[PDB]
Symmetry: C3
């Protein structure tokens, strides 16, 4: 079965794939679909190691950066959460095609609408209230910023879940969380 | 084709079509639209009979499940909310098509991404903070769960609204609630 | 076909196109993408002149209306926030096409789902918690009402950010906010 050019993801159930604090200490599920000038996306993050399994007082916020180049290609180089060997790309069945992204701009956040320097402007963010573990008694905040950590010629997505301190010695895991944005192309 | 193979709804303004506590006590308006690997969803529930008109001290939550067979076809028997006489199929103008769903899996929550056993797992859930009757002064939580009330080959969607206990004798009407999930196929 | 007949926006980085409190005192960024029976929209508003830079103790709500006609076309007169000169049409490159919208209704809110004499009805409203300036400590709400200010034959989209009164002397800015709804056609 062919791959889907409107869909980039990390596969429905990735093995640990992000080294946020320690090696492969988090399991990141990310699906980005292109719906015309808008990409509808869903993300989830569950800790499997260290502080992610047991939030410390310093684990105030958990975040993941995904840096893209001028053509919208993910750069595994740090600060990119995804390890340079984890699967990321076009959906193909329950897996990821080996074809390189040739329509990445259609997946990158529009710089005109979201400038590379203006990573602090309100509009370069979509903010929501969600719950830790899915429990309505453990609220936290998910900030998603665009082009907030680029490279003069590239793109990015950042995910920040704040308000954790209140939940020390508790596993960090978010529900399936949605977000959307205007595409560069 | 006279219909939209990419949409399955209950029609825009359906009559009572659910029996949550007593027979036909609620109107469910549901639209599921597929775009690649994701389904955008909008749901709305308006109580019309019994406890749904007047919330009781013990009425703490209000939910509706929807179970599907191994081919994404809705099974209209408990615990499914929508009754046998209810409209449900692909959009065709303002009505539903009588054609059977040949692409049901395309609208089902991914079992790999949302396991049958792991229903309590934060990932199998999209939760938020919505408001009763669309009143910002009356916040209530909503939790959409994927595949937590299935039957080995089946699939399901579950909508739970809680924190209602503090609105005794008020009518139960939710605002239009958005949601989404990674599809099976 | 250079433009995209599935997107209706105001281009990504538009000049002040709103005169909410005083002339051209606010920039409104709006993108509506059609994905079958549902539309995925992203709203964004920032104040640049007058009271919008300093929230008053009585200013609990700040908002804009967009009124369309029988064919889903924008009426640049009151109550429509967007001034006559403001860019608005099909996305073409980073600008807008000159082609008159020939399918406005596919972007309009379904009147059967969202009735005119029912703007108050919970269903005719999608509500969420968001944050002023995108500051996770400055929560507020956004209400998107469907067909609440029309012309019997018209359609509309009303966005109202509230819970601002307790932020006096602060510049009004909102993050990019998501919303969606069932289409007429």
């Amino acid at each position: 079965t062919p791959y889907d050019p409107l869909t980039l993801w990390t596969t429905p159930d990735p093995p640990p794939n992000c080294s946020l604090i320690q090696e492969l200490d988090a399991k990141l599920t990310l699906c980005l679909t292109k719906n015309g000038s808008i990409v509808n996306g869903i993300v989830s993050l569950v800790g499997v190691k260290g502080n992610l399994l047991n939030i410390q007082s310093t684990t105030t916020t958990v975040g993941v950066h995904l840096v893209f180049d001028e053509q919208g290609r993910l750069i595994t180089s740090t600060p990119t959460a995804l390890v340079p060997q984890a699967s990321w790309g076009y959906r193909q069945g329950q897996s990821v095609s080996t074809n390189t992204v040739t329509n990445g701009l259609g997946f990158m956040p529009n710089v005109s609408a979201y400038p590379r320097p203006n990573a602090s402007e309100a509009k370069s963010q979509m903010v929501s209230l969600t719950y830790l573990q899915g429990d309505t008694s453990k609220p936290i905040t998910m900030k998603v910023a665009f082009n907030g950590i680029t490279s003069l010629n590239g793109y990015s997505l950042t995910f920040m879940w704040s308000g954790l301190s209140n939940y020390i010695n508790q596993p960090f895991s978010t529900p399936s969380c949605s977000f959307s944005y205007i595409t560069q192309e």
